[PDB]
Amino acid sequence: NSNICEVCNKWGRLFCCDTCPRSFHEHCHIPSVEANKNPWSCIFCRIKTIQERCPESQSGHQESEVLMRQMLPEEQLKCEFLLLKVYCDSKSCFFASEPYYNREGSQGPQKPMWLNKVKTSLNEQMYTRVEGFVQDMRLIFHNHKEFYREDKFTRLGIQVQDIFEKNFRNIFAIQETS
Ligand SMILES: [Zn+2]
Ligand SMILES: [Zn+2]
Ligand SMILES: [Zn+2]
Numbered sequence: 001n002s003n004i005c006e007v008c009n010k011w012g013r014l015f016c017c018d019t020c021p022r023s024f025h026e027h028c029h030i031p032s033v034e035a036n037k038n039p040w041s042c043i044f045c046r047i048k049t050i051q052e053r054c055p056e057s058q059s060g061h062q063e064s065e066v067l068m069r070q071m072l073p074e075e076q077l078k079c080e081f082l083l084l085k086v087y088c089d090s091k092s093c094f095f096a097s098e099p100y101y102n103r104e105g106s107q108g109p110q111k112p113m114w115l116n117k118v119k120t121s122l123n124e125q126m127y128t129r130v131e132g133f134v135q136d137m138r139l140i141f142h143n144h145k146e147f148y149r150e151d152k153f154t155r156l157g158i159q160v161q162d163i164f165e166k167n168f169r170n171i172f173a174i175q176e177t178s
Pocket of ligand 3: 053054
């Protein structure tokens with residue numbers, strides 16, 4: 001196994017997957033690393049196993065169908081994985097914790113959103129449909145763009161949004177279009 005965390009690229013107290021070489025901090029993996037479980041498979045492996053059990057799940061899907069799906073375990077997991085892939089980008093630190101809003105010329109958002117609020121939401125089973133998760137995720141980057149306006153700092157929202165959207169398309173097998 002790795003000598004660093006797969007998410008945050010640092011060494012530390014790591015928990016190693018029993019089916020791939022990946023390693024994780026406790027609260028870096030999503031869900032948080034389960035107490036016992038020997039063997040333990042990480043979320044990368046568990047996502048792989050879905051595909052290897054239903055190879056037609058990689059056939060193209062419409063976004064609109066994906067968003068109405070209930071958050072049964074297999075979709076709960078994909079959201080968890082998608083969230084994790086956003087945390088893997090270092091620029092995610094700008095979106096992790098509760099923001100504040102006090103800039104000349106701008107007003108704060110009506111509904112603030114951040115990645116740890118979304119992680120806690122997934123964790124306490126608050127989302128019933130994929131739709132709900134994807135909306136809060138998109139909200140984070142929408143709120144960022146509206147607040148930083150023309151400051152080049154809005155570029156960070158676009159960059160991390162792109163990481164989210166590419167990974168959404170891959171994980172949920174969206175039909176590839178132009
Ligand atoms: Zn980590
Ligand atoms: Zn693994
Ligand atoms: Zn089947």
